Design a protein around this nucleic acid. Structure first.
Ligand SMILES: Nc1nc2c(ncn2[C@@H]2O[C@H](COP(=O)(O)OP(=O)(O)OP(=O)(O)O)[C@@H](O)[C@H]2O)c(=O)[nH]1
Ligand SMILES: Nc1nc2c(ncn2[C@@H]2O[C@H](COP(=O)(O)OP(=O)(O)OP(=O)(O)O)[C@@H](O)[C@H]2O)c(=O)[nH]1
Ligand SMILES: Nc1ncnc2c1ncn2[C@@H]1O[C@H](COP(=O)(O)OP(=O)(O)OP(=O)(O)O)[C@@H](O)[C@H]1O
Ligand SMILES: Nc1ncnc2c1ncn2[C@@H]1O[C@H](COP(=O)(O)OP(=O)(O)OP(=O)(O)O)[C@@H](O)[C@H]1O
Ligand SMILES: [Mg+2]
Ligand SMILES: [Mg+2]
Ligand SMILES: [Zn+2]
Lengths: 346, 347
DNA sequence: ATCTGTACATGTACAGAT
DNA sequence: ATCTGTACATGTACAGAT
DNA sequence: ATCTGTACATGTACAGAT
DNA sequence: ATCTGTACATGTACAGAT
């Protein structure tokens, strides 16, 4: 039933190989250009993030997210309108981009560089997608076997302690524990040029922390290892991502929703239900169902807090209209009470 | 439990911890500073705190501290000393030339210089009453005897640090896969390994750093013994077993061949056999201690206790401990066990 | 002026003291 | 239950070195 | 500063066993 | 049907060499 859906969603080994060798060629070349030139971004390092590198990509290997992170010292941070997630950054290579380090100016140069290197690539069919305003990504479209998108995300790396707004976030104490949380919070934090001073605004990223959690998700150390037993936590994430993707293809009414909403929700569930035995593979139906119910509670209450930044409600009225949330509840309730017809279509 | 009251006696006092640590840290820091002067041969050596006090299983007074002075030693090839598994020769104006004899890094020559340096710095200390203990042959330690309120021993252990992959003899060791898991084991084995001085050119592997990690990360659940987790009694069992041996050892010289490392090794095997946190519930302290005793007894009677890291090395081989010694220790453990542990009442 | 090995600054788990 | 000393990891300031 | 080599985790594929 | 064992594939950390 749901096993058969996961069978459909499973990536093929062949497709993984072909997509990765092409993706890696392009990425490596872009990364070399950023450094083996006296560009402003000399020093950037690659950080592979998001679903393909977390092993929760579904359907096909057609979307890759790579952070190019740049270490930069000092960095005074000023919280933007108590959003929790948005900041202005303050004071060398980066002179060209300011009082205040302008996200847009810096992203613009990053983008320009990337576009130029892409023009110089003759051995692969690869263009740069038209820019989405306010978006932190430079997005590459590759062809050949298949359509493949690659999001190149510029990121500031700071080694200071995480901003105050995150103090009460990452509530993993009863699940992964205090030692894990203390150590995760000793890692650097990241700032991505998302923008709401809207053009100078940056947004926090915890993509690195999320990756660690996806690959270290059990209360037992052996969860999902070769001498442990297999959770169905990841499988539930896949099923929920797929239900939203399918609904999103059909209804433009759901444009404001994205996979990060589902990722966030399941982090909350994984915290609510820390035991590995509450995610037994034999209870895949119940587990999926309790996740659906939780997401619906989030929709009904108009409340889904950033897992890392609790004051930031991703389902605030300001970000998603009530109407949209009620529409999505209708559609989830329906699939749920009719055996998920939408899992059968293409 | 009678055993809760024993642990109450064994519990270290914060006051005593403070006083001992203030002095120990002063001495160690000064010894460590001196090691990085006048281009001594040990310049670069770094401090690694290890053993029971740093693992929080020191019992009944904070009077013995173990600190490794470890020195990164890059290009080195190892030759196993007669298939022992644990003993090696080390080979390559390098600083350590002064201890070489035909490509072979002499343990005793290097330890001798280390020792000499330490003795000199100790003479220069006027703050505190501290002498250097007479050398025990084949011991890797330079041992300091301090007296502030009371007697405190500090073992300064010279150590070579290699960053290569661990020696072959350890491949099947550290069998933590069903307990702490494969990711933990892979990562542990990416840490360096250590060589300490044990004929006179022979060195011995140390895993004191790995043992410390395991003692402080000992559960199958990540929250074992944490503030939002459940308490286990693994460390309490280790303390009771250490205490039974200590008490027996101070009364009977027949037990000179036994040491606390035997009980640490045994309990690592038990922790592997019984991985679940629920098999070390605080409420089941008696059973848990008792099963540990029974296992140790089987080790004694069958003359088999393998090094946790080096499986082919039997710490209870006939060549290391006479049968008579092992039978003597079994009778004494059997006795304590069947008569209410009277030795826990002593002194 | 700039650079750096050493020591301090900050944060918290662990476990003893209350 | 809460408070508190030691150990330990990482970040950052700086007298002395360059 | 940059690159390879090694080791093993996380995957997918499929036969034979259950 | 599911599980177990082997084979084949990629990603990732870090040592040692350059
Ligand atoms: N690794 C990583 N990728 C990110 C991050 N933020 C955004 N991205 C990528 O950038 C893409 C677009 O970012 P969004 O935040 O959706 O930005 P947008 O399209 O301007 O705006 P929305 O309509 O708000 O989605 C995402 O789909 C990811 O590929 C981040 O913090 N880390
Ligand atoms: N941290 C640490 N300390 C060690 C190590 N090996 C020995 N020591 C310390 O040095 C002391 C002496 O080591 P032993 O192996 O007992 O040497 P010995 O007593 O001469 O020899 P035995 O007769 O085999 O006991 C130990 O009790 C510890 O205090 C090691 O690998 N790491
Ligand atoms: N609004 C957001 N706030 C914070 N981080 C975000 C946000 N959107 C995306 N991210 C981060 O960027 C990564 C890439 O986002 P993306 O939208 O590609 O999804 P994904 O997690 O890779 O899943 P999929 O690509 O299959 O939909 C996420 O995994 C997450 O770490
Ligand atoms: N024979 C040995 N082989 C290998 N490592 C050993 C050996 N003896 C001791 N060690 C290591 O040296 C450390 C210090 O040894 P020591 O004899 O002080 O015991 P301990 O573990 O500190 O317990 P305690 O000192 O309270 O009896 C041990 O923790 C262990 O890591
Ligand atoms: Mg993605
Ligand atoms: Mg000791
Ligand atoms: Zn525990």
């Amino acid at each position: 039933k749901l096993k058969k859906v996961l069978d459909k969603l499973r990536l093929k080994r062949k497709d993984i190989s072909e997509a990765a060798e092409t993706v890696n060629k392009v990425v490596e070349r872009l990364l070399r250009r950023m450094q083996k030139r006296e560009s402003e971004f000399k020093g950037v390092e690659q950080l592979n993030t998001g679903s393909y590198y977390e092993h929760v990509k579904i359907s096909a290997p057609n979307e890759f997210d790579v952070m190019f992170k740049l270490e930069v010292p000092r960095i005074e941070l000023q919280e933007y309108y108590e959003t929790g997630a948005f900041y202005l950054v303050k004071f060398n290579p980066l002179s060209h981009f300011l009082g205040v380090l302008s996200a847009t100016k810096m992203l613009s140069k990053f983008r320009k560089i990337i576009k130029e290197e892409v023009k110089e690539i003759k051995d692969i069919d690869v263009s740069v997608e038209k820019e989405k305003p306010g978006s932190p990504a430079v997005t590459l479209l590759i062809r050949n076997p298949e359509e493949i998108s690659v999001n190149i995300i510029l990121a500031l790396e700071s080694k200071g302690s995480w901003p105050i707004s995150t103090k009460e976030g990452l509530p993993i104490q009863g699940w992964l524990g205090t030692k894990v949380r203390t150590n995760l919070r000793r890692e650097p934090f990241y700032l991505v040029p998302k923008n709401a001073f809207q053009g100078e605004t940056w947004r926090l990223s915890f993509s690195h922390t999320e990756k660690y959690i996806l690959n270290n998700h059990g209360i037992e150390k052996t969860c999902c290892e070769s001498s442990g037993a297999k959770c169905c936590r990841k499988e539930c994430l896949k099923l929920m991502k797929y239900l939203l993707e399918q609904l999103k293809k059909e209804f433009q009414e759901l444009d404001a929703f994205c996979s990060y909403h589902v990722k966030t929700a399941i982090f909350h569930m994984w915290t609510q239900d820390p035991q590995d035995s509450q995610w037994d593979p034999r209870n895949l139906s119940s587990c999926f169902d309790k996740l659906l119910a939780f997401f619906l509670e989030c929709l009904r209450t108009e409340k889904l807090d950033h897992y890392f930044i609790p004051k930031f409600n991703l389902f605030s009225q300001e970000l998603i209209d009530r109407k949209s949330k009620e529409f999505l509840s209708k559609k989830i309730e329906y699939e749920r009470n009719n055996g998920f017809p939408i899992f059968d279509k293409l």
